[PDB]
């Protein structure tokens, strides 16, 4: 109905990204706090911002998880990409995990210049990962925990459409801002 | 490096060397075929989000057709192909615009002009979002006007060179 | 990937869609504005050091204006934006030329031509250094002559196209 | 980023701004000089395997001439120069075509057209392989015809612009 | 003999890439199972697919090898690139090594769904490195082991021409798909 | 005063890159031996080639420094980038550090083919980092130590103008030439 130069009618299209599900992961946002990344039609990860922690120990037994080799390889790959993308992560106590039985549960304790804290790096990475919704690029929230757990497929994308863009963009961020912890990497 | 994936030949003969998006790839569940002019830009442009989404979709279809798809996912395949498929810096630029409060692209929606009489169209450009909502048409009408002008100038130049050759 | 940062609109109206370097960004503390022709090349070329410095400076300005600046630095911001702003391979090329003893660009000094009568200019190209000193003008005068030749050929071709349109 | 290595000036004066492959770089042990027109495409194209091999060979020669070659190799040098010399994504695309059963380039063999009378040629394109053998010439003759047609159109346009200038 | 458009004869050339030997590694294939990457005209790596293992211990004393600093630095760099390019490597016992006296001996035990195994990841990296020779892109072979040993130069390239392409392409793959094994890298 | 084609005057400009101080680090050269990378107008790193060592122990307590979290995060990032950019670093005793109280002190001991030594890799990385003007690209100097310590602002750029190019270029070099020290990274 909108006519430009008298001869050019303006038209739009919207891509149904959902059809990419078998060849790339799809991230979406349910609301401010809840976000999902689905891999195929059967499994995925739920990312929750929450005041209720679910892990009450200081362990993250990654090597035992690898040796047991019970987890889903795609989910562990995604988790690794997320963690390697965090900038300036230097408080290993802030991350606790549970992999018993092959499940994937990772919890970041965000409680405490506020910019140079684990909470900021974690939240920036989370913002990049779902890309769905302080000084310089600094982010702060009121949430005490970020929890990442495996989940089955369900139509979660109420606030934003599923998209692989965040994950693909984050792929290049891996190891970009990691610190050296020993002289021999 | 730079993207390299060549688009597969369009199924629709209306656009011999163009590309067609079938009903499954679009929300309006219709078929949209783009001509040779718009698709030729996708080989050399570096800032067209739409050409990166086209490469993603084409890779998806070809992988589904030539490899035996299973429900368990091969993250490895896309992990290796990603930089051959899309410019991750386009993504970074959209992120930077987002964090700076500048209107940005969510790769969801695209606008293009359609020359009713002939059926020729322009290369779709991303419909930007800002403050959680799509920009009103009046906010970027200048870019649409620019697109009409360029499609005019290029058509005139092609017609002149045609006249020249004959 | 490839650089993507779009230059912000020039403050000076003499160059409507061009770019202006203010007194602070230059050592001679004057204002130098470059026209649309030179700045449009910055969108498509991959080996123009000057277009990478333009993107860096524009990013700097935009960050200073849209983000709350503090003295403590956000290293992360530039770490993420770098490949969206500049081609690090240009840097690698200049490094390789340096270690092989070929004159190389150290991004300090640039030369360009000025058509006195009109004031239109060409895109500045880096003044190379070698053996710790700037090259003497006689050592690269052929490139300057070639640039003049390009400025001629292109202007005549645009004028021809103009004739074609009328 | 993007490749940046500038080709060194051709030794042969027959091609003033082209490039020459000496007897050592080819299996047929002869000298093949390509003109400035074909080699100029190598500065802007991103999907020409031949231009990436040219950059590799030129880097090899320049490194051997300006650096003191020794038998122990400095792998670091090529490790840092690689992305300045070639698009690794071209390689990734050829790998993806290989694993999908699509004909692919193994960078060994290249074909080009020769205008006997004048001696001008086109930019060589990789001879694809499939199922362990080189494709038969009849399988890609359409691409050769496309190359001839494009070379004709560009030639006609250059003479027209010449006529324009006079 | 093959005229196109009446006035254009079709001509071909083949590059002798062996001349690049001093500035980049050259890979080639001997047969289906054996592939080589030579560095200069003096030394290189032989990669063998075989049922016959040569190492019968579970050690890989990389730190001690670095300490002694007797190996060829280029070969160790190539080994590092190869290992860092393997996707989703999570069974450290599958890789064993011997470096005494500066020698390089590396053995990947490929014995074992078959898509999600160390065998597949190792074989994809090897396939990329040499360019010779399942669900999705997954690869399986009948060999039980992949062995990497230093070797002297000899004309081995009977099946494929020497080429730097595999190594150069693999350079960008480094660390792209490695897992996290602790919170502080 | 220089006329080309009778109508084209050759004119020049020089950028004051120092003005970028707030958004990217700026490196400059004092003389042959001393080079600096400043971060903002308040802090930075002094890099010195010298015969006078300041550390006489073999410790580098990186993990304790991370745990204590007293250092400047930007400086630690720059140090991490420098170290991860060194090619083929394989003698961890050659690098010593002191981080008590949030200070940064790093000392590379360059004393000893001469090309395949820590001294060469560290010196190439340092040359790249400041870029202020052996066989192949190999570098050798007469200095026994490279010392990196934090410092406050002063006008140091007598020999070369401040520039961010070296740091930005080095960002892509990170981890490109690191060796593997274990099977499970
Ligand atoms: C993450 O991993 C930790 C540590 O795992 C241990 O260490 C690694 C390196 C491997 O060797 C594992 O096999 C080890 O288990 C786990 O914590 C351990 O949990 C186990 C199982 O519950 C505990 O073992 C039991 O502990 C009780 C007695 O503990 C006391 O004595 C031991 C030995 O002296 C001592 O280490 C401990 O501190 C106590 O003093 C008892 O029920 C029983 O006999 C058994 O020994 C083990 O003690 C725990 N280790 C520590 C250091 O606390 C986490 O459970 C695991 N988490 C997840 C989510 O998997
Ligand atoms: C790779 O590295 C392993 C481990 O090396 C050990 O650990 C590293 C961290 C360093 O500290 C090394 O110095 C250590 O040796 C090597 O295995 C070791 O080989 C050495 C040399 O043959 C063995 O030492 C001998 O072992 C015999 C007795 O062993 C018994 O007693 C020791 C001590 O209590 C005990 O550790 C071992 O399990 C046995 O119970 C004997 O001939 C002699 O006295 C001497 O001690 C050493 O024992 C080995 N360590 C282990 C844990 O088995 C590998 O040889 C090396 N491989 C390669 C290919 O390089
Ligand atoms: C990029 O940003 C844009 C702009 O914000 C964003 O557009 C929004 O998308 C959401 C999600 O699709 C839209 O919300 C929908 O609106 C209505 C009313 O509620 C319903 O159709 C939807 O809910 C139904 O469908 C859901 C999905 O099946 C179910 O989960 C749910 O139970 C309901 O059945 C849904 O809420 C929203 O309207 C638009 N906004 C605008 C202005 O159009 C876009 O999604 C973003 N793209 C990406 C890829 O993130
Ligand atoms: C790209 O793909 C092509 C096509 O598959 C592939 O070409 C093959 O190259 C190999 C290696 O050069 C050729 O093998 C030769 O074959 C003949 C016939 O037996 C022999 O003359 C040759 O033996 C000579 O060379 C040996 C090794 O130097 C010596 O040991 C021996 O004494 C001889 O001198 C040699 O085996 C093969 O014929 C072609 N195949 C075809 C169809 O042309 C090429 O290698 C691939 N390139 C890359 C880089 O992978
Ligand atoms: C690119 O290469 C060029 C050419 O080599 C190089 O230019 C050189 O820059 C230095 C630093 O600015 C110049 O040295 C200056 O020379 C005079 C005489 O000493 C003085 O003006 C300067 O000293 C004063 O100013 C300094 C800076 O504020 C103070 O630190 C000092 O205390 C003094 O107050 C200074 O020494 C040198 O002359 C030029 N060389 C030429 C040939 O022009 C440039 O720096 C290189 N750029 C990069 C980014 O590497
Ligand atoms: C997430 O991090 C917060 C902040 O560190 C943790 O809360 C902290 O819990 C510790 C104990 O684990 C408290 O330390 C103790 O506090 C009192 C004195 O203040 C006393 O009992 C001991 O001497 C000891 O110091 C600490 O105060 C508390 N910090 C707070 C509440 O700000 C929290 O436990 C972490 N959550 C998880 C799930 O790990
Ligand atoms: C490995 O590659 C190197 C570099 O291409 C090869 O060395 C080069 O070998 C050629 C052929 O022998 C030499 O050319 C000859 O040199 C002299 C004059 O210099 C003379 O005999 C001939 O007229 C001819 O030009 C070339 O100089 C030489 N280059 C160097 C720097 O040594 C080498 O042959 C290759 N090795 C293998 C096994 O292929
Ligand atoms: C390469 O990997 C294979 C497969 O893991 C290794 O063979 C395995 O060897 C172990 C012993 O080292 C065998 O375990 C033992 O088996 C029997 C019961 O089945 C019994 O003696 C013990 O209780 C123990 O479980 C294991 O079965 C065997 N796996 C096979 C044959 O599939 C092989 O040793 C590895 N090669 C090298 C050179 O290390
Ligand atoms: C580091 O670079 C920054 C950015 O260029 C410098 O801050 C800027 O300094 C200039 C020159 O003093 C300021 O311009 C002046 O500002 C006011 C009006 O705003 C007035 O005095 C003048 O008319 C002139 O425009 C500029 O505002 C200031 N920018 C900010 C954001 O503070 C800084 O000086 C440099 N630091 C060093 C140590 O060189
Ligand atoms: C920087 O590295 C050099 C070279 O490694 C260190 O000097 C070395 O110091 C060690 C002792 O720490 C010397 O080893 C001892 O030497 C004599 C026999 O030569 C004897 O006392 C012992 O049996 C032992 O072997 C070593 O010779 C010496 N190397 C030299 C002088 O070239 C230097 O200490 C290091 N600097 C710092 C600050 O750590
Ligand atoms: C989740 O809880 C926080 C408060 O966490 C408490 O304070 C922390 C410092 C620490 O001691 C925790 O253990 C405590 O449970 C809520 O933050 C409040 O937010 C409101 C609204 O913005 C604000 O007015 C209050 O001042 C905040 N209180 C504090 C102490 O900062 C936060 O809102 C909770 N999130 C949700 C979604 O309910
Ligand atoms: C710094 O000192 C070196 C010499 O270091 C000594 O020798 C080493 C082998 C090792 O044992 C160190 O601990 C010693 O302190 C000086 O190198 C000399 O340089 C001159 C001039 O180039 C040369 O003629 C001498 O042969 C060198 N000496 C040696 C032993 O190699 C170097 O010059 C000193 N640098 C400065 C700036 O003072
Ligand atoms: C969205 O909000 C910001 C302030 O939060 C405001 O500056 C901006 O103009 C708003 N966007 C639109 C399109 O009005
Ligand atoms: C600098 O020295 C090199 C050799 O070290 C020489 O080739 C070059 O010509 C010198 N520079 C100038 C500008 O003359
Ligand atoms: C090679 O064989 C495959 C099946 O193994 C077949 O699909 C393919 O067409 C063959 N190659 C060619 C070029 O025909
Ligand atoms: C490959 O060549 C080696 C070395 O001669 C030989 O031992 C082996 O049998 C060959 N392998 C195959 C699969 O033919
Ligand atoms: C492997 O390297 C060692 C150390 O130089 C050497 O002695 C040995 O001969 C090499 N092995 C082979 C099979 O060439
Ligand atoms: C370099 O400058 C430093 C700092 O002023 C000074 O101590 C040293 O003597 C200088 N070095 C040389 C070699 O001139
Ligand atoms: C650095 O600049 C800030 C303003 O951005 C100012 O507060 C401060 O005094 C300056 N520091 C120095 C040492 O000049």
Write out A109-166 in H/E/C secondary structure.
Answer: ECCCCCCCCHHHHHHHHHHHHHCCCCCCCCCCCCCCEEEEEEECCCCCCCCCCCECHH
Phi, psi of B124 (to 5 degrees): -60, 140
What is the DSSP-derived secondary structure letter of residue D104? B
Angle of helix C75-85 versus helix F73-85 axis, rounded to 10: 50
CB-based contacts of F89: which residues, under 8 Å, 6+ apart?
A: A183, A184, F83, F95, F118, F121, F122, F178, F179
Q: Check the CA dihedral F84-F86-F91-F92 and report its sign.
A: negative
To test the contact with chain F by mutation, choose from D76, D77, D78 the residue with the greatest count of F C-beta atoms within 10 A, namely D76
- Between CA D50 and CA D39 the distance in angstroms is 10
CB contact under 8 A, A179 and F66: yes
Instruction: At D98, list the tokens.
Output: 């290989």
A70 part of a folded domain: yes
Residue A108 phi, psi (nearest 5): -105, 125
State residue C105 phi and psi, 5-degree precision. -95, 125
Cα(A29)–Cα(A37) distance, rounded to whole angstroms?
Answer: 9
Long-range contacts of D129-132 (CB under 8 A, 24+ apart): D129/D103, D129/D104, D129/D105, D130/D103, D130/D104
Q: Which domain holds residue F56?
A: 17-171
What is the total count of domains within chain A? Answer: 1
Q: Report which of F170, F117, F122 is spatially closest to residue F145, judged by C-alpha positions.
A: F122
Which token pair is E135?
A: 């669900």
Closest CA to A177 of C5, B1, E185, F38: E185
Which residues, in sequence order, are CB contacts of C151 under 8 Å at separation 6+? C113, C115, C122, F8
Chain C residue whose CA is closest to D59: C96
Q: Please report whether residue F94 resides in a domain.
A: yes
Q: Where are the beta strands (DSSP E) in chain B?
A: 19-21, 32-34, 104-115, 125-130, 133-134
Residue by residue, DSSP assigns B104-144 as EEEEEEEEEEEETTT--BPPPEEEEEETTEEPPGGGSHHHH
What is the C-alpha separation between F4 and F11, in angstroms, rounded? 11
Residue F27 CA, ligand 18 centroid: distance in Å: 17
Q: From the CA of C99, how many Å to the nearest CA of chain D?
A: 9
Six-digit token string for D14: 């027959």
The Cα F177–Cα F185 span in angstroms is 15
Name the E strands within chain F.
3-4, 8-14, 26-29, 34-39, 43-50, 95-98, 105-109, 145-152
Distance, in Å, from the CA atom of B163 to the CA atom of E133, rounded to the nearest integer, reads 54
Interface size between A and E, measured as CB pairs under 8 A: 52
Q: How far is CA D106 from CA C165, D29, E109, E132, in A?
A: 47, 20, 29, 11
Residue in D2, D43, D67 nearest the CB of C89:
D2
CA distance C104 to C93: 9
Residue with tokens 């912890």: A181
Backbone angles phi, psi at C80, to 5 degrees: -80, -35
Q: Do C63 and A135 touch (CB under 8 A)?
A: no
Burial of D150 (C-beta count, 10 Å sphere; 0-12/13-18/19+): exposed
Cβ of A137 within 8 Å of Cβ of C74? The answer is: yes
Closest listed ligand to the CA of D135: 15
Q: How far lies B67's CA from each of B62, C21, E131, E137, F102, in Å? A: 8, 54, 20, 7, 55
> Is the distance from the beta carbon of residue E30 to the nearest atom of ligand 16 less than 6 Å?
yes
Instruction: Compute CA F163 distance to the chain's CA centroid, rounded to the nearest angstrom.
Output: 13
Contact C82 F74 (CB under 8 A): no
Within a domain: F27:
yes
Interface check for C6 against chain A (CB to CB < 8 A): the answer is: no
In whole angstroms, give the CA distance from residue A126 to residue A120: 10
User: Which among F20, F168, F147 has a CA at the least distance from the CA of F81?
Assistant: F168
Q: Does C71 touch chain F (CB under 8 A)?
A: yes
In a domain, A156, yes or no: yes
Region class of E29: left (phi > 0), else alpha (psi between -120 and 50), else beta: beta
**Other Cβ atoms closer than 10 A to F64:** 11
Residue A33 within any structural domain of the chain: yes
* Rounded Cα–Cα distance for residues F75 and A92 (Å): 20
The whole-angstrom separation of Cα B100 and Cα B97 is: 5
Q: Which of E64, E179, E181, E182 to mutate to test the interface with A (most CBs of A within 10 A)?
A: E179
Calculate the alpha carbon distances from E151 to E41, E42, E46, E146 in Å: 11, 9, 6, 15
A160 φ, ψ (degrees, to nearest 5): -140, 150
Helix (H) or strand (E) run with residue A76 in it: helix A73-85
Hey, is the C-beta of D155 within 8 angstroms of any chain B C-beta? Answer: no
Q: What is the distance in A from the centroid of ligand 1 to the CA of A94?
A: 20
Q: Report the distance separating Cα E73 and Cα E91, nearest Å.
A: 26
In a domain, E128, yes or no: yes
Distance E24 CA to ligand 10 centre (A): 37
CA D152 to chain centre: 20
**Whole-angstrom Cα distance, residue B24 to residue E162?**
46
With an 8 Å Cβ cutoff, are D2 and B3 in contact? no
C-alpha torsion sign, points D28, D33, D38, D41:
positive
Q: Which listed ligand is nearest to F119 at the C-alpha?
A: 10
**Could you tell me if residue E42 is inside a domain?**
no
Give E101: exposed, middle or buried? Use CB within 10 Å, 0-12, 13-18, 19+.
exposed
Residues D89 and B3: beta-carbon distance below 8 Å? yes
- Of D72, E84, F133, which is closest to residue C95 (Cα–Cα)? F133
Q: What is the DSSP string of D153-165?
A: HHHHHHHHHHHHH
| Farthest-apart Cα atoms in chain E, separation | 69
Is residue A51 lining ligand 1, measured as CB closer than 6 Å?
no
User: Which one-letter DSSP state was computed for residue A182?
Assistant: S
Tell me how far CA of residue A147 lies from CA of A36, A178, C78, in angstroms: 11, 21, 29
Beta carbons of E107 and E147 less than 8 angstroms apart: yes
Distance of CA E100 to the CA centre of its chain: 21
d(CA D112, CA D122): 6
In whole angstroms, what is the distance from residue B62 CA to residue B130 CA? 34
Say yes or no for a CB contact (<8 Å) between B82 and A168. Answer: yes
Resolution of this entry in Å?
A: 3.3
Distances (CA, A) of E128 to B85, E50, E74, E86: 19, 18, 19, 11
CB neighbours of residue C72 within 10 Å: 18
Fill in the DSSP letter of residue A15.
Answer: B
Per-residue buried b or exposed e for D2-32, using 16+ beta carbons within 10 Å of the residue's own CB: bbbbebeebeeeebeebbbbbeebbeeeeeb
Helix runs in C18-74, H state only: 36-41, 49-66
Across the interface, whether the CB atoms of B84 and D93 are under 8 A apart is answered yes
Which residue's CA lies nearest to atom 3 of ligand 17?
Answer: E103
Q: Which residues of A20-46 are buried (b: 16+ CB within 10 A; e: fewer)?
A: bbbbbbbbbbbeeebbbbbbbeebbbb
Tokens of A182: 């020993």
The experimental technique behind this entry is: cryo-EM
Most informative mutation of C97, C130, C134, C137 for ligand 14 (most atoms within 8 A of CB):
C130
Contact by Cβ (8 Å): F122, F86:
yes
Distance from CA of E104 to the nearest CA of B (A): 29
Which residues in chain E are closer than 8 Å to F63, comparing Cβ atoms? 184
Q: How far is CA F70 from the centre of its chain?
A: 21
Question: Chain B within 8 Å of D156 (Cβ-Cβ)?
Answer: yes
C-beta B131 within 6 A of ligand 13: yes
Q: In what order do the strands lie in the sheet with F95-98?
A: F26-29, F34-39, F43-50, F145-152, F105-109, F95-98
> Which residues, other chains included, contact F166 with Cβ-Cβ below 8 Å and sequence gap of 6+?
F27, F37, F128, F129, F130, F131
Residues 6+ apart with CB under 8 A from D54: D7, D19, D39, D42
Q: Which helix (H) or strand (E) holds F166?
A: helix F165-171
* Nearest bound ligand to the CA of residue F159: 5
What's the N-to-C CA distance of chain C in angstroms?
Answer: 41
C66 and chain A in contact, CB less than 8 A: no
In a domain, F144, yes or no: yes
């Amino acid at each position: 109905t909108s006519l430009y130069k008298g001869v050019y009618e303006l038209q739009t299209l919207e891509l149904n990204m959902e059809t990419l599900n078998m060849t790339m992961p799809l991230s979406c946002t349910k609301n401010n706090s809840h976000h999902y990344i689905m891999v195929g039609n059967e499994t995925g990860l739920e990312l929750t911002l929450t005041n209720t922690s679910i892990i009450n120990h200081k362990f993250c037994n990654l090597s035992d998880a690898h040796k047991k080799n019970l987890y889903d390889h795609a989910l562990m790959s995604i988790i690794s990409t997320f963690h390697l993308s965090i900038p300036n992560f230097n408080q290993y106590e802030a991350m606790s995990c549970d992999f018993n039985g092959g499940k994937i549960s990772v919890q970041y304790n965000l409680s405490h210049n506020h910019c140079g804290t684990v909470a900021n790096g974690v939240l920036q990475t989370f913002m990049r990962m779902a890309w769905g919704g302080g000084n310089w690029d600094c982010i702060m929230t009121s949430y005490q925990y970020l929890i990442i757990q495996n989940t089955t497929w369900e139509d979660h994308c109420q606030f934003s459409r599923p998209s692989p863009i965040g994950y693909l963009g984050l792929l290049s961020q891996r190891t970009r801002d990691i610190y050296i912890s020993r002289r021999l990497l | 490096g730079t993207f390299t994936w060549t688009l597969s030949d369009s199924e629709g003969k209306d656009t011999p060397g163009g590309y067609c998006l079938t009903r499954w790839m679009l929300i309006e569940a219709e078929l949209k075929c783009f001509g040779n002019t718009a698709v030729a830009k996708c080989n050399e442009k570096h800032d067209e989000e739409f050409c990166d989404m086209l490469r993603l979709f084409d890779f998806n279809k070809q992988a589904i057709q030539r490899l035996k798809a299973e429900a368990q996912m091969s993250i490895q395949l896309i992990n290796k192909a990603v930089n051959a498929l899309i410019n991750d810096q386009l993504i970074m630029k959209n992120h930077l615009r987002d964090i700076m409060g500048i209107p940005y692209c969510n790769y969801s929606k695209y606008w293009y002009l359609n020359h009713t009489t002939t059926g020729r169209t322009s290369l779709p450009k991303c419909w930007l979002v800002s403050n959680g909502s799509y920009l009103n048409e009046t906010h970027f009408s200048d870019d649409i006007e620019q697109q009409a002008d360029n499609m005019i100038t290029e058509m005139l130049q092609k017609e002149y060179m045609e006249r020249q050759g004959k």
